[PDB]
Structure 1
Amino acid sequence: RGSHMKAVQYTEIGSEPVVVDIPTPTPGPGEILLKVTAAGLCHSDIFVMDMPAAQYAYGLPLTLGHEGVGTVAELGEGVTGFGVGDAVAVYGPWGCGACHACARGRENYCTRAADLGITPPGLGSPGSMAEYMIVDSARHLVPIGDLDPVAAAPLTDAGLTPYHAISRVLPLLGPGSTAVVIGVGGLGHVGIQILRAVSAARVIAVDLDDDRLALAREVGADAAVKSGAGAADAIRELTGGQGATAVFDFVGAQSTIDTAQQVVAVDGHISVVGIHAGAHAKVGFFMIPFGASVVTPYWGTRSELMEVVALARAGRLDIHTETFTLDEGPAAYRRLREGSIRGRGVVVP
């Protein structure tokens, strides 16, 4: 290959990411080096890059990109289970692999990763927005077969994170139930499709743009209303006043969380997936229906990633993507900031 590789890095606090030529890494024992085939942009990348110097703690420079797919380039010493050339997706939320949470497969909830300094690619470790990347262990590689890399990259976060949020309360979403999806962006437009595939719940979408509402219907939403002060009333108009069994808020604004608490049913669920600084649900007596649980989920488990890949291979996921080159990385992040990307932006080296 080449001694150097193109990469999109966050180098200075408050500055836009830059395209640089950095050394090509080599896999240590147990590690795997991949030739990246597609790297996705996530709105949480903007959040990280918008943190002040006091809060930012992911080191500089940082190769961005935690939505990674690639082909096995080089196997580290003792790495069996994958051959060179195998198409694989990168399981992002790396854990210690030995705590109680990790042994259950829930590595995203590892209780020792923070103490041990184990961070995901693109969020502390070198990310996938580069020609090559290192993966710490073979257990963080999931085969994708002949899936198109551009549509496979979002599965690692844009599919895995909604899939996990939905899975936490899937038994509540039988026939007759209603699931409200707020935000029809990169995550939400996949979350709608997941709901249609693993449940018989009625899906009501919520967003601000008429194009986002049309996208929601395009991907299986049974109904779509506009976000705002009237969103709660519009939803309850469609449910006959009953209230939604579950509300998946992929925006995370205080106004969207407020709408969630106004429409969630008794014994229901609100999932705050989107990140807005300071926004929070208010879980207290007479401020939220009885028994309606609230949680901020984080990414997903490894088996959930394999299930998401299985959904894609069965044709149940229609991922909307716009392709960029590595040199267009910083330009793509400007596009994502202004909300000009319909769906998920993906960089292809």
Structure 2
Amino acid sequence: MKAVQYTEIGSEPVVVDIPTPTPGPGEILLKVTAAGLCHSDIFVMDMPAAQYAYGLPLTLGHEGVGTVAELGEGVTGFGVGDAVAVYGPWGCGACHACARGRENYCTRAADLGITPPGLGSPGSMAEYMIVDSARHLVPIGDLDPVAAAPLTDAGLTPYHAISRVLPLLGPGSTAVVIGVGGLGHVGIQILRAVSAARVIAVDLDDDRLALAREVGADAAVKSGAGAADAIRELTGGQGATAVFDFVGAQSTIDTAQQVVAVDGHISVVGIHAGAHAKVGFFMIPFGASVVTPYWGTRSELMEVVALARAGRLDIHTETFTLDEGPAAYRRLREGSIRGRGVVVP
């Protein structure tokens, strides 16, 4: 089968031919119908040799949608042909966090060597993929697979981050979204669907600001040195109830601390090496909590799928072939994918 793999430290992903896999006991083989590119793939491929821990080669792609092709021995709950999305942050399934479907916060996964598809286990950017267990599949019914693939991360991660502090986001609240890319442009729509928050979007690029308005942002602000003041002008000196930073650079985190309200929240979702919020007296308002959330929970993925089926999400995508896999990643690096890049095998 055809797949797109990271094969050498510091090199670009390449199209390879590798054996179509066979599902073992408990496992499920999907024919992949759509595979999303995530900016985290770029972070991974940029890691120095001394830090990269996912193994080589690695079939990329941790946003996966497909149809069930073959059932491993003993698998129940799905039949051949079923359209499903892959729950990515695999956990042990048995610890206290896993018991609540919070497998993203599994306390055993690291020790047991359990890794996500595309991030340690073979990913979805191939004609076929293996899923470890039936509980990491979620039915999507007749959802267009291309729009559905981003739901597994671009949808799921912001959904989780927002969900952590949803009770803060009542009428009169303001939510700031920094970074209107794959995650950001979906995060705006989630905010509008599950809360009455006023949504202020922030990006370096005017066209991304335009995208922000297209998907529902009430306001759009240019990132950089003037952004904090501009956000405050919109909120009055009260500041923003919550800031969801899908960039996570030191500059954006700094902006977030300068606009967040007393008893508010900063979610640092974007990943930038060494960048960090500075949480201490006189450096952040009283009671404004900060967190680096990770991916999302099982029930949350189901909720994201429900938003999509209700027509509440307009996922902006561009489609590529598998052969275009490497070219798509160059486009992602350069910031020319207006939304989510999705490979259709």
With the shorter chain as reference, the TM-score category is over 0.9
- Tell me the CA shift for residue 226 of structure 1: 0.5
- Tell me the CA shift for residue 104 of structure 1: 1.0
- Tell me the CA shift for residue 242 of structure 1: 1.0
TM-score by length of 1: 0.99
Deviations 1:213-259 (A, max 9, x none): 11111111010110011100000001111100000000000000000
Residue 38 of structure 1 aligns with which residue?
A: 34
Secondary structure, counterpart of 1:70 in structure 2: strand
Q: Distance in 1 between matches of 2:344 and 2:5?
A: 15
Which among 178, 183, 189 is matched to residue 182 of structure 1?
A: 178
Deviations 1:50-82 (A, max 9, x none): 001100010000000000000000001111100
Q: Distance in 1 between matches of 2:169 and 2:210?
A: 24
Q: Distance in 2 between matches of 1:195 and 1:14?
A: 37
Q: Distance in 2 between matches of 1:69 and 1:274?
A: 23
Which among 126, 130, 133 is matched to residue 134 of structure 1?
A: 130
Secondary structure, counterpart of 1:54 in structure 2: coil
Residue 76 of structure 1 aligns with which residue?
A: 72
Deviations 1:158-213 (A, max 9, x none): 00000000000000001010000001001000000000000000000000111011
| In the alignment, structure 1 residue 336 sits paired with structure 2 residue 328 | no
- Tell me the CA shift for residue 309 of structure 1: 0.2
Secondary structure, counterpart of 2:308 in structure 1: helix
Q: Distance in 1 between matches of 2:242 and 2:298?
A: 24
- Tell me the CA shift for residue 260 of structure 1: 0.2
- Tell me the CA shift for residue 311 of structure 1: 0.2
Q: Distance in 2 between matches of 1:181 and 1:37?
A: 30
- Tell me the CA shift for residue 138 of structure 1: 0.1
Q: Distance in 2 between matches of 1:227 and 1:165?
A: 21
Deviations 1:265-321 (A, max 9, x none): 000000000001110000000000010000000000000000000000000000000
- Tell me the CA shift for residue 45 of structure 1: 0.2
Secondary structure, counterpart of 1:305 in structure 2: helix
Secondary structure, counterpart of 1:241 in structure 2: helix
Q: Distance in 2 between matches of 1:11 and 1:225?
A: 40
Q: Distance in 2 between matches of 1:126 and 1:210?
A: 37
Q: Distance in 1 between matches of 2:240 and 2:320?
A: 38
Secondary structure, counterpart of 1:23 in structure 2: coil
Deviations 1:67-105 (A, max 9, x none): 000000000111110010000000000000010100011
Secondary structure, counterpart of 1:147 in structure 2: coil
The count of aligned residue pairs is 345
Secondary structure, counterpart of 2:196 in structure 1: coil
Secondary structure, counterpart of 2:200 in structure 1: strand
Q: Distance in 2 between matches of 1:241 and 1:342?
A: 33
Secondary structure, counterpart of 2:238 in structure 1: coil
Q: How does 1:226-237 map to 2 (within 5 A)?
A: 226-237=222-233
Q: Distance in 1 between matches of 2:254 and 2:30?
A: 43
Q: Distance in 2 between matches of 1:84 and 1:227?
A: 48
Q: Distance in 2 between matches of 1:232 and 1:48?
A: 30
Secondary structure, counterpart of 1:19 in structure 2: strand
Which among 221, 236, 260 is matched to residue 256 of structure 2?
A: 260
